[PDB]
RNA sequence: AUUGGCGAGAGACCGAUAGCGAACAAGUACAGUGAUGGAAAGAUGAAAAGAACUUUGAAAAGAGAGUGAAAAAGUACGUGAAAUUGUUGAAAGGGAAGGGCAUUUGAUCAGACAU
RNA sequence: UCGAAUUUGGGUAUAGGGGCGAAAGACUAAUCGAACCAUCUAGUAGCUGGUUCCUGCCGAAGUUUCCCUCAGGAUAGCAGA
RNA sequence: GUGGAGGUCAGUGACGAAGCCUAGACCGUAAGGUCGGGUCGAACGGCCUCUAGUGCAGAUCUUGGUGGUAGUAGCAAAUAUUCAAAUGAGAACUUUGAAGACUGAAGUGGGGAAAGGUUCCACGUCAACAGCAGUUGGACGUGGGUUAGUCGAUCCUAAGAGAUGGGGAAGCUCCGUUUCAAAGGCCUGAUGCAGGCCACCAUCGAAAGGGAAUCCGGUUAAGAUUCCGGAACCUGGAUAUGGAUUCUUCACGGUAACGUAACUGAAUGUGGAGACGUCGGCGCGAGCCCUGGGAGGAGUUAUCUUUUCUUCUUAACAGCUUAUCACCCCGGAAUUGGUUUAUCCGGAGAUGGGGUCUUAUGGCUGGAAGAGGCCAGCAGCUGGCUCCGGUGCGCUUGUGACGGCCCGUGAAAAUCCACAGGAAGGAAUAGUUUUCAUGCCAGGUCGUACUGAUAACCGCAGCAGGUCUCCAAGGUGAACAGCCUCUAGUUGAUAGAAUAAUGUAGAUAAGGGAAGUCGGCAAAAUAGAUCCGUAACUUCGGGAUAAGGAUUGGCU
RNA sequence: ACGAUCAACUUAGAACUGGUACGGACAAGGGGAAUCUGACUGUCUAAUUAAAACAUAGCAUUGCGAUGGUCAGAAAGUGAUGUUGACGCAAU
RNA sequence: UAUCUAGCGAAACCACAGCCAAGGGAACGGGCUUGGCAGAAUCAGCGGGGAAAGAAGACCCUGUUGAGCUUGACUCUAGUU
RNA sequence: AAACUUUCAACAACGGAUCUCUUGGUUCUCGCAUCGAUGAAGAACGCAGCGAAAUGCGAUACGUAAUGUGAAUUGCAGAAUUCCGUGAAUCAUCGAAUCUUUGAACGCACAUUGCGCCCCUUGGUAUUCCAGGGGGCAUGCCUGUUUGAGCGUCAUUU
């Protein structure tokens, strides 16, 4: 789950997480929450662990 | 909740204390103002343009 | 005073037509040269009914002389068209119902029908159901014809100037009483809102020339002049004679 | 009544959010701004509504570039460190 | 309603994100006039007319 | 010429119900669908030194304690009037109270001999 | 009253001497025999109300004449300085 | 006497200026002036002059503040609350349980449109609000939450709005929407183009009209046709294999209606779908309702009850099959026949025999029992059953064939399809297509929580008002009338004690029966159903439920 | 001539029966003789007047053959009736 | 419901206030004068009075104040001929 | 006699007058001439470690660069030879930049966070389809450039 700027899209998200986490995403699902920001449900491919690739960017 | 704005507050300089005061201080300062002004409105807020009055004058 | 009924007729807003279900206008063919010179055959494809108009709309086909398209023209329907009919229009066509020919080359004591009221446009005279023209007489010197239109009124109009033959078809429409205010309501909910109709008598004096007054009376006399502005010419405008006619009056 | 009963059916909205300005004055039907004009090139004010021209006059907003030209001028439009 | 346009939830956005009172730190800074959060909205209060 | 803009200097001007509507988060809060309408609101102290601690109370708070030159300055804070209100003290009072003239009664008080 | 000249949502059109009106001067945002907002405008008023300290001296008129004059003015008179 | 200015008293003052209180004192007739005492903290005064925004009891004066009224009017519509336990300082009001009730499916239920905007949910919590209370809350403080190729927007056009070319207007702007115009985008093979094509006319306009395609189960504190699992479809685009198709170059079969796994087709034309009113009855389907057998559980059991309640379900999608209407072949009909509830059809070919089609819709199967449901056993696991039926003037709804009605005949476009045409291309590994099957990639942006109202919208509010719509059980009964109940939801509206007058609302009254009163105002009377009987008048349709009478249960 | 099987409320009748009750609660027309008035259904004074007022169909009158009648605009190469044509539009 | 109680708790209005008779008086006093009388504090009712409250009377008149409407008022005007 | 009511004083209340201050206003005078298609004024939304607002700013966001000064900012936390120095600062100056979506607002529209077209480039077995990055596409008018139109018209050619 990640905070996104109100300006990308779904193509871009997918991109830029393949860039920055090299991860391949299964799909990318966004809102807007109610604070104003988009919010991206990113799922990978099976054959990447999130909760791994989780606490390897920080967050455990 | 791993931090609560409680932590937040508490580094920024008000700790759980002063900020139970201070809320009631905001509260009394609220209520202070409404109380006025409900009691500057009263004298003009019943000041209907058109009222009809059916038994007229 | 406020501007009175009549007077706000004339800007629009609620008092256009309405026009939502009408099949179209209902024109001739464009005097072309085939149509001018000689003649051409359409086929009536379908007959319809107009929407706020008595007289059914007749549909028929015509080839495009310059062009493959099928030119369907929306005509009105004569007593006697029928689908399937073949409509022959031109000068060279001959005489049977529903075929349209310029007014020069029908014989006397003719009833054509959506007469052409000069050469060029698409049918202006007798177009209501069940009205015609009959041709009074010919002029090739001036290549004119006189016609008598059903206004009982006489004119006289280029020879070239087209007509449908035979009559507008609905006739005696007006035979029928409408009992119900509804048949009004229904008759007019497609025509320009015209219905129903407040006695300017019964108006307010502010309303209507008609109005005020402890009586409903018009007060002053209700023949109005031509020459009154807009606003005072309601009544009987420009009125020649008034009452009752009592008497044979021609036919 | 004309009174409580018929003020419970106003549930539209003859105005909206306006673009050119941020006021809830954009009528929707007219497609005209009732307090800016917009979309006409002139903002609507009138020299009768002093109080209005004040409202939206400059130097009621930021002011973004037209805050340096003082500056600017003072300086004389010099270019270059 | 809930069918709504996105300047609305923009506008929606910046309104939640002004519901709050005052911080509490603000109230002690040097020469600090600002007692309450004088603006402070609430729905049963006063519509945002937008 | 200049009631707009920028930068200055002044007044037999106004001094928080005055002076611009705005000395303050003022064309803000707020009302109206909309054009528009549109306020209230300045002052603890030199310095928070903003009351550690004890006790009663569930708590607010209270009583001590303490800071202070002053809590008769406690974030309701300079001074703190009047209307209006509580307690204490005095007096009067059979369908008004108040007032003028004159004195009895009670309370209170100055001056002068003392020079 | 309740199957139609029915009721109604949304869109849309008609804007103030204008609209709309099965016509009541009705409706036009609690405003209608002319809506609302701002400006002209501190509109004018022979009309109503008010008009803020003390003492001393003097101290009146409701009458003449003329005004679309009769709830008011000018003029003369009375009064002060 | 006051604000302010020039001069002066080398004036007063933190050892206390100004202000304020002072039935304490002095002076002046008075406006006022002076002094003492208390409070207080930083400036102020006498005199000679100058200056004015200079003196308040009024103006239904302005602003601000406060009184008697007065602990008074009152907190009385929407049937109704009670006991115990917990929590807590504190319980009529919070929670749980146990009762008693109500809304009674045109609800006090479950969702939505406009509107609201975080009210949604969790934790902590009572200063204020909840016109009583409060531990509770739509309140306060802090956070969490809204996941789409398939639902909408986006796209189309409706009523209408509106530039450009133009034309008016001093001008802000107005008319105008295809017209007094030199008004462009489509197919290509490669910005001409091989070159061709077309002459339409900017654009906006519906979260209820038209519209490409998604369903089930599960999941959260709050999400959901969006997430998860599974199973599908649409669009765009690459696109390979198989199949199909041919030397008779672009398929066969059927008498025909027409069938298929496909089975060339440019420009240009034609047609269809989109695409449509309302009502009445009839047929069919779905869902619900009623009910039988049976397989489980629960309730009742003084007595009876083969009992009463309850689960037994099968989505989108795909294959096969399935129909009224319609049509085709044979045959040629009066002794006229067929047929609807409704009278229509037949030598323009009926009845009849045999067939074709649309697939609304239903059946079977796959989806899929592995789901869900209902039970039992053991400590989450393991087992079972989830089956077979019946009926209808039943309710809602869909649909078909019809019929009635109109001086009412009851949208448009986007888009998609087919057809006529034969431009162009394809010949023997020469190939051409790929409206057949399978395979591959992608589907962006915005909306998505909650209420939708006797508390979340508007009415100054937590206002008995107003606000569009969907679903809709049982009994009585003609009835989505009234009354009672099931699922579901509430039990909210300050409360306690007594029962005076006068009230508001509901009622009843002996005898008389409008004598009351302006007036039978208010009330009462009759009332459903069946049978009988029904006048004057009439536009012949009505009057008419005229008037006036009788019967009405239960059980066999 | 005709048998078996299955199935639903609808009407009529007859006994018997009761404190003569029985549309048992609910639900639910008072009627008749006339007069004035408006044909009727419908509509309006939202918030004192719902009527005999308005409207209505019916009848009648008037203008107009488009270079036109009625009406709108400040003007227009402007517009409504008019997607119209006297069985029509417009005014009474 | 009223009434009593716990909690909560306004408003209208108010020159000062509240016993009468008569007299005079702005010709109908609560106050003035002459008389009658007059004892704290109060509760529930009540509708005689307070010329009770609500509104600068709408009826009428005045104003050298208007407005709607009408016409053959006075003076003009769009349009039209 | 109490209660109650009234009058006054003391203390205490409600209220914020009086007095005294004043980073404000008002009026006068003096000097200056400087908005915007190189995108103004105005708007919307966002940005701080901890801010709702004011103030400041624009995805480089209470700001970056340059210069001057020369050790802070401050409510807390943090940073601290960062300080005998290209160097703190919510400093001053300001000549370089960034300047979201808008707005005269400019690709077409806008109640859409809608719909295009062109150029270069990257990826998806791709000139066409999809996606990402960068740059563009208004009108009126002028000068000029290029391509044209008109038997309006000249010369020349068959």
Known sequence: ?60 | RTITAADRRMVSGVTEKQYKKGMKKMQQLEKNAINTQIRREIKRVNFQTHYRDELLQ | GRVIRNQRKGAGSIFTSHTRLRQGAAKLRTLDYAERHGYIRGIVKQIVHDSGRGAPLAKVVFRDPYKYRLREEIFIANEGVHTGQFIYAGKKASLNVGNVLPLGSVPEGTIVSNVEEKPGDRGALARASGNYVIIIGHNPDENKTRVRLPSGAKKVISSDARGVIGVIAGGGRVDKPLLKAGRAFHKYRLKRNSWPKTRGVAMNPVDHPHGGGNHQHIGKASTISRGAVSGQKAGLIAARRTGLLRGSQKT | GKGTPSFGKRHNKSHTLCNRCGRRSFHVQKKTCSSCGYPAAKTRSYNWGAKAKRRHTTGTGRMRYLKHVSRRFKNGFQTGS | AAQKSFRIKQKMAKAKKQNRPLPQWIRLRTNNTIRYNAKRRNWRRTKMNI
């Open chain 1, 1 to 60: 789950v990640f905070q996104v700027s109100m300006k990308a899209n779904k193509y871009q998200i997918k991109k830029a997480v393949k860039e920055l986490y090299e991860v391949d995403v299964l799909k990318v699902n966004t809102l807007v929450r109610p604070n104003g920001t988009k919010k991206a449900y990113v799922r990978l491919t099976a054959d990447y662990d999130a909760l791994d690739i989780a606490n390897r960017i920080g967050y455990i």
